[PDB]
């Protein structure tokens, strides 16, 4: 499924649940109301989750206005967060106030596949403080490794973990 190409879909139900979707018209992540049932994949709990899915391949967009400011966007051509000038309105989803925000949001689902597997302690009874990337928390978290077997989501330090993941 290409999530970002689906329309908003409130569904057929009567619930009232505010969510985000990627709007193809404006190419920005926007709020809509979800009816709790049916609908489709283009539906996110937060704005950042929506951008992490749909925003990071868009070109930079200055827009019409000229209340200008320096912003950051993930450049798809270099896969680097770079500065651009935002006119102040009508921009797209690829727009962040800081370099770090741009990096953390756009890299959310773009880490190596092994970063997304559950931390595996292994069978053995050792206790080695190892770190792993936990995508739910979006953080490299300490855990305790048995000492043999396990998986690649297993790092000796935190900065080691966040370097890989």
């Amino acid at each position: 499924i290409s999530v970002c190409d689906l329309p908003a879909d409130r569904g057929q139900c009567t619930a009232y649940i505010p969510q985000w979707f990627f709007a193809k018209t404006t190419e920005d992540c926007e709020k809509f109301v979800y009816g709790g049932c049916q609908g489709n994949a283009n539906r996110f709990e937060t704005k950042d989750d929506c951008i992490a899915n749909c925003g990071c391949n868009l070109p930079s967009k200055v827009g019409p206005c000229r209340v200008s400011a320096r912003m950051w966007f993930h450049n798809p051509e270099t896969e680097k967060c770079e500065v651009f000038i935002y006119g102040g309105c009508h921009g797209n989803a690829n727009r962040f106030a800081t370099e770090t925000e741009c990096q953390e949001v756009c890299d959310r689902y773009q880490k190596p596949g092994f970063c997304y597997q559950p931390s595996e302690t292994g069978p053995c009874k050792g206790s080695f403080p190892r770190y792993y990337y936990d995508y739910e928390d979006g953080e490299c978290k300490e855990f305790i490794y048995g000492g043999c077997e396990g998986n690649a989501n297993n790092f000796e330090t935190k900065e080691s973990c966040e370097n890989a993941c």
């Binding site: 999530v3 689906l6 994949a41 391949n57 798809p76 051509e77 773009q110 596949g113």
Partner: protein, 304 residues
């Protein structure tokens, strides 16, 4: 001892495909149909009882979009399912006797390795195209079916970039050339994720397909058989109205090339996990999908 309830490297999958063909040399053959942009082999499992002449066959396609891991995992369980139930299940056993099953578990090997090692959500091929520093084209917008019409982008940085021209992606050309050379395919089923949809032509236009009636009937029968395992619910319809316009899609190319039974499955789930479907759901997904697959295949067996 291949854990079918785990996600695997391309290496492991290719190897398990080899073991399957080793254990059933009578029934299964690993055939190389081409290579990827980065020169990896494209392997299919051919299932047959027809001693090497061209029979009618159905194409089972998976992993064209690399991040859609449940797709490849389902496809390789299905390889094992087909051999393990030959002459133990009247259903496949009866299909196999009439026709050949071609199974491509990883239609986009380069992208798959890239998801495992670099970028979990990668969708496209890894072709490097003059004109841009952006990499890859969407192999499911690359086929010769209203190529470059509405439902695909010409921005190389787009997830749905159609590419420079129809069949530009060697992964896609490989399948096209092989199906056309054969020339008597009857079914073409493309596995994707996620959303739980089972769709049929057309995606490139609102126009009803000449077989739209029967397609919906089968789809719905297949949908019901699938639901009858664990209660998993699918919606059914033509692509363009069910999800969005999509030009140059595989099932459209197929249908316009005289393969009548052309369907897409968007497997589990509906959004709780999305592309990151936990490993503990691979088998449940594969079991239920199997029934929908057989239902379609039975139906193809009978229209022959």
């Amino acid at each position: 001892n291949f854990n079918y309830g785990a996600y695997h490297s391309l290496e492991a999958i290719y190897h398990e495909m080899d073991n399957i063909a080793a254990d059933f040399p009578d029934l299964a053959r690993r055939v190389k149909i081409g290579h990827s942009f980065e020169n990896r082999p494209m392997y299919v499992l051919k299932f047959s009882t027809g001693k090497g002449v061209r029979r009618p066959a159905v194409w089972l396609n998976a992993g064209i979009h690399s991040r859609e891991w449940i797709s490849q995992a389902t496809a390789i369980w299905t390889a094992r399912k087909i051999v393990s139930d030959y002459q133990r299940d009247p259903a496949i056993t009866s299909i196999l006797e009439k026709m050949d099953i071609f199974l491509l578990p990883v239609a986009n090997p380069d992208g798959y390795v890239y998801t495992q090692t670099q970028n979990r959500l990668w969708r496209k091929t890894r072709s490097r195209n003059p004109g841009s520093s952006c990499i890859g084209a969407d192999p499911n917008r690359n086929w010769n079916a209203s190529f470059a019409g509405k439902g695909a982008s010409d921005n190389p940085c787009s997830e749905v970039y159609h590419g420079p021209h129809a069949n530009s992606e060697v992964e896609v050309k490989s399948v096209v050339d092989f199906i056309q050379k054969h020339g008597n395919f009857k079914g073409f089923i493309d596995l994707h994720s996620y959303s739980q949809l089972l769709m049929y032509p057309y995606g490139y236009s609102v126009k009803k397909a000449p077989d739209a009636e029967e397609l919906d009937k089968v789809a719905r029968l297949a949908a019901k058989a699938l639901a009858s395992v664990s209660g998993t619910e699918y919606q059914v319809g033509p692509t363009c109205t069910t999800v969005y316009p999509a030009s140059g899609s595989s099932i459209d190319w197929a249908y316009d090339n005289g393969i009548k039974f052309a369907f897409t499955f968007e497997l589990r789930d509906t959004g709780t996990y999305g592309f990151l479907l936990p490993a503990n759901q691979i088998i449940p997904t594969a079991e239920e999908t199997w029934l929908g697959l057989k239902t379609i295949m039975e139906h193809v067996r009978d229209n022959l």
